[PDB]
Every structure is written in C-alpha cells, then in structure tokens.
Amino acid sequence: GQGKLISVKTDVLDLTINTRGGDVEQALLPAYPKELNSTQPFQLLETSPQFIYQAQSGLTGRDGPDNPANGPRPLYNVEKDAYVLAEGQNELQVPMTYTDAAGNTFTKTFVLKRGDYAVNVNYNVQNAGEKPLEISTFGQLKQSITLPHTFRGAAYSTPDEKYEKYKFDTIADNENLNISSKGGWVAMLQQYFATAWIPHNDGTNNFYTANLGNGIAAIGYKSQPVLVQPGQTGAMNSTLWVGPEIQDKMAAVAPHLDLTVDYGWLWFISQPLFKLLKWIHSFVGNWGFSIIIITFIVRGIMYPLTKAQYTSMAKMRMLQPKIQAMRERLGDDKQRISQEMMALYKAEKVNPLGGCFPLLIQMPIFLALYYMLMGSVELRQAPFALWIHDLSAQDPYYILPILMGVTMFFIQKIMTFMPVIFTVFFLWFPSGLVLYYIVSNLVTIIQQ
C-alpha cells in the first residue's frame, strides 16, 4: 500500500496505520520494555527492509473496494495525522471515509479503548446506487517466516476445532489451510505476545493460510458476503487483538483465545498453577514471594508422597546388609541376585526400586513450572528482591544456581558430583524456577 501513515496512540497501544486499505503497519507496546534495562517500548508489528509483520483488513467480495478486481485498494480520507487518547476519555475513535465513483460511501473506523489491547475495526457502508452491494469483510495477518523453545507461527479456532496450531514451515511448503466455520478467530503467535483477528458476523467465516512469496507467511479470514440494498446502510465488524497474551483479558474478546499461551504438552498442569500463582500475587504484591508460597503449597499437598518414599528408602538402608549377604551367598550372578534382592524389596513392599523416584516425580513439576515461567506474560520482567529484576530470565550473576547447589550438597561416585552438575544445569534456566527449587530444597533442610 502507498499513501500516508496516520498515528493512533493510547496508554497501552502505539499504532501506525496506512490510509490505503487501513492496514496496521506498526504496533508498539508502551507498557512493555523492549529489553531489560531499556526505556524503549516493545514492537509487535514492524515494517522494515529486514522484517515485516502487519495486520491487514478491509472490504472484499464482489463489490468490496479492497477486492483487486474492483481496482486499486481504496485510499481512505482522514481528518488528521495524529490521534491521542484524552485524559477524560476511555475510548478513542479513528474514522476514515472513502466514497466511490457511483456515490456509495465506505466508512472505516478504528475504535480503541484505554488499557485495552483489543482494537475494534468496524465498517459502515451506505449504498447510493440502484443495485444491491455484495460485500464481505476480511482480516489478514502477514509476517516474515524467518526472524532477523517456544512456538512462532500461526493459530486458529473453530467451533469444531477449539484450538489448533499451524506452523509457518507448512505454509512455506505451499500446503495451506482452507476451512470454514461460524465465529472463531485466527492468530499469529510468539512468546508473551500475539495478534488475532476476531470476526463479528452472522455468516460462515472462511479461514485460510497463504504463502505470499519471498518467505512471507500469512493467515486470515473471509466472512460470508452480505447484501446492502439500494438507499440502505450496512455494518460489518471485526476485532483486532494486538499485544500481550494475558488470559483473563483475551477471554473477554473471544472464546478459546486464552489458549494462545504455550504451556507445552504439560498444559493441564501449568494453567492451574498460573491461576494459583496469580491468586497468591493478588494480595502478596510480588511474584517472587508468590512463587515461594506456591512452592510451600505444592510441598504441602505432596507431604504424603515425600514421606512414603522416605519410609521406603529408610527401610532400604535397613536391608543393605542382607543384600551384600546375597552377593556373598549366591556369588557373582546378576539374574538370581537382582531378582531376589528385588523380590525382597517387593516382598517387604516398601521399596519401589527407586532412589531416583524423587527425580522422576519432579519431571512433570519442573517442566510444568518451566513452561509457566517461560510462557506467562505476567512473569515477564517480573521483580524479585535483591539483584533479581527478571524472573523469566536466568540469574545474571549466576548466584542462584550456586545457591541451589550449596543447599543441594548440604543434603547429607556419580552422586558425589551431581550437586555441582545442577549448578551448570541451572545456569541455563529462569531464576524463578531456580528459586522454586532452592526453597523446595530448603524445605528438606528445614525438615532436618
């Protein structure tokens, strides 16, 4: 598109909109720092020689001006180049109007709200002709496949397919989506943030993906066409989400939008924990302290499980003399020994043949929390006491993994090395998770 760019700003959203077609070329998030130790707002949508990510919309169909068959994309008229949300206003409207040769009027209006990342894109069509106008609305998100772990791609939702992801690589292989459904939405995802189009109509929306060429992937929707009778006026709506993947906020815009967060295959464990963590954060006022409390709470519900294996392993030391006696009695044959030392363990029914059972039970926990930590937008650049400014990121001074390690050594051949191995294993993990484990290992130390 080519014409001129207009600026629309709220407290949470900084947009750059092209009047030709009303596409959104730039989008900044003032509420979120670009990086840590930065004063610069995060940039979701970009239009660069190096990278592109836009939210496009307009009126297609047989008589839609944005339809390439009806000529060039419509150049909307605006009153000014700068729009700013007022102090005594919760809402900002940016109406742009186009009138064709036949005299029909096409009005496009961006209406933004304070503190809201959901931008409504609504249309008004006034038929001045003698024949009915057949118009369908659309909304398309396009983005470069390769950037200048988490999931970066597209996603959608239908009444049948409640949630489904779509990789850019699939789109890149020119194998595209082509489904239809009533309501629903399409979206492009990344860590902590997401764009989405949510149609508001009476029809059967058509969802699709598209290779736009030059390594540019796209996903969008095309609504069922509506008829605007002569002399009459018609209206068409859609909602553009652009910003953070906050679950409570996305639930109000459209159903199942909240699922845009990547909690991995261990999804059913992370979502309650985040609701749990957020529930604590409600009156504690801190994320780090909330994590310490949730640490205790998970330890509190798991006290029967920790005690049971301890009962067992205490018993294991009691049975160590007899096993060496087996070794002496049967000699050096693994079959008889292993089966019957096992048989003893099983017979006395305390030992699960696992001292690493504490490890494999913490397999879901580590992962679930990790995905929560790395996926939750609320924990992004979340503050903790002392020298921790980002809970989602690793400790910059690498102190907390060493902290963890010393607590770990303090729990008194390969096991004579593994407490330090955890220091380097935890150098590559978020401080929040390390914090969790330090506190959790403190619970064992307090147990002592």
Side-chain angles (χ1 to χ4, degrees), residues 1-148 150-326 328-333 336-340 342-348 350-352 354-358 360-412 417-447:
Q2 182 263 342
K4 72 175 184 301
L5 308 177
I6 64 176
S7 179
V8 178
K9 298 184 81 289
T10 58
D11 59 323
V12 293
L13 274 175
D14 189 335
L15 273 74
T16 297
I17 291 110
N18 194 322
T19 65
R20 164 108 47 194
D23 311 317
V24 180
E25 298 188 354
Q26 316 282 351
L28 296 79
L29 309 184
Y32 292 82
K34 188 183 177 186
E35 78 177 20
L36 194 57
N37 198 268
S38 197
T39 188
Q40 243 194 328
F42 192 88
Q43 194 167 13
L44 214 86
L45 304 184
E46 195 197 347
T47 294
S48 214
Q50 62 174 11
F51 180 73
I52 192 176
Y53 189 5
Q54 298 181 348
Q56 301 172 294
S57 62
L59 299 180
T60 175
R62 191 182 66 88
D63 302 293
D66 307 78
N67 193 322
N70 290 114
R73 243 273 203 58
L75 183 69
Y76 293 96
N77 289 331
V78 294
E79 277 301 312
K80 45 188 175 183
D81 294 31
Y83 297 78
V84 176
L85 183 60
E87 56 165 29
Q89 215 179 26
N90 300 276
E91 196 172 285
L92 173 68
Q93 297 206 334
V94 189
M96 46 206 318
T97 61
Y98 171 73
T99 315
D100 59 345
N104 300 312
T105 306
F106 301 97
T107 302
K108 188 184 180 70
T109 305
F110 292 89
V111 41
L112 293 78
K113 295 186 178 184
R114 177 178 301 273
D116 202 339
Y117 291 99
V119 180
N120 298 321
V121 182
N122 305 327
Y123 303 89
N124 186 89
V125 174
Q126 187 170 12
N127 192 5
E130 62 181 26
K131 71 161 189 175
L133 291 176
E134 179 172 327
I135 299 179
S136 178
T137 184
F138 79 96
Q140 177 171 283
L141 304 173
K142 65 170 183 176
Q143 182 182 6
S144 296
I145 296 177
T146 59
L147 285 171
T150 47
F151 171 78
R152 177 176 177 269
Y156 64 89
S157 178
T158 70
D160 292 337
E161 309 154 80
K162 301 184 180 183
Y163 187 79
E164 189 79 16
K165 301 175 187 175
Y166 209 100
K167 304 187 61 176
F168 282 165
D169 205 336
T170 308
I171 304 179
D173 292 338
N174 298 279
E175 303 176 10
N176 292 289
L177 178 72
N178 189 15
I179 59 175
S180 299
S181 71
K182 323 198 92 227
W185 50 260
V186 296
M188 277 189 168
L189 309 187
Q190 61 183 274
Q191 192 171 19
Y192 302 145
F193 303 106
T195 45
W197 274 114
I198 301 93
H200 300 296
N201 56 49
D202 255 332
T204 304
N205 299 311
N206 167 240
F207 297 159
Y208 69 96
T209 60
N211 195 335
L212 299 184
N214 295 21
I216 304 180
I219 186 180
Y221 86 93
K222 300 168 183 173
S223 73
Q224 180 176 344
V226 297
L227 292 157
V228 183
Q229 296 302 133
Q232 302 184 3
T233 305
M236 290 143 247
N237 302 352
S238 40
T239 297
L240 169 64
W241 183 269
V242 43
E245 296 169 331
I246 308 180
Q247 308 191 42
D248 272 330
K249 295 293 107 188
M250 288 185 301
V253 181
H256 300 263
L257 186 48
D258 45 79
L259 303 159
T260 49
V261 293
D262 189 35
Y263 286 160
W265 327 263
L266 286 78
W267 148 271
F268 42 90
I269 319 176
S270 296
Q271 183 216 137
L273 284 172
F274 179 74
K275 284 187 178 180
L276 197 66
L277 185 75
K278 186 184 184 63
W279 201 88
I280 310 176
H281 175 265
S282 180
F283 33 60
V284 170
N286 189 326
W287 285 117
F289 289 20
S290 308
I291 296 182
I292 304 178
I293 304 169
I294 209 191
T295 326
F296 288 179
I297 301 170
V298 187
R299 296 284 293 153
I301 62 127
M302 235 165 177
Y303 179 78
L305 203 154
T306 172
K307 232 206 181 121
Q309 73 192 351
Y310 251 147
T311 298
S312 87
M313 189 151 186
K315 186 268 194 210
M316 219 196 65
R317 283 192 56 95
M318 294 292 304
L319 260 295
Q320 287 178 349
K322 319 208 183 190
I323 297 166
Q324 301 294 66
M326 316 197 55
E328 292 163 16
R329 176 210 179 152
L330 284 316
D332 290 335
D333 32 37
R336 317 170 78 188
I337 294 184
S338 269
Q339 211 61 26
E340 264 49 42
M342 205 200 51
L344 216 292
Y345 282 8
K346 312 313 294 173
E348 269 291 287
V350 217
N351 311 279
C356 62
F357 203 78
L360 286 170
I361 61 187
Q362 285 287 310
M363 229 44 251
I365 316 301
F366 179 84
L367 273 194
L369 264 100
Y370 173 75
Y371 274 108
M372 173 189 96
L373 258 293
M374 285 283 286
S376 303
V377 198
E378 281 82 341
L379 279 73
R380 171 197 165 90
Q381 303 200 187
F384 181 63
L386 287 320
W387 63 88
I388 292 87
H389 302 293
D390 194 295
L391 283 182
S392 64
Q394 8 72 13
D395 186 38
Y397 293 110
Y398 302 149
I399 290 180
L400 257 48
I402 276 88
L403 233 77
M404 157 101 273
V406 191
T407 74
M408 192 100 236
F409 122 64
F410 270 154
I411 311 182
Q412 299 187 17
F417 248 68
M418 218 156 293
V420 180
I421 306 310
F422 293 159
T423 297
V424 310
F425 181 83
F426 273 139
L427 289 187
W428 286 86
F429 279 131
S431 73
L433 199 42
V434 179
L435 189 147
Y436 178 92
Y437 279 140
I438 298 175
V439 180
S440 176
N441 273 33
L442 276 176
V443 179
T444 318
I445 273 48
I446 299 322
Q447 169 261 74

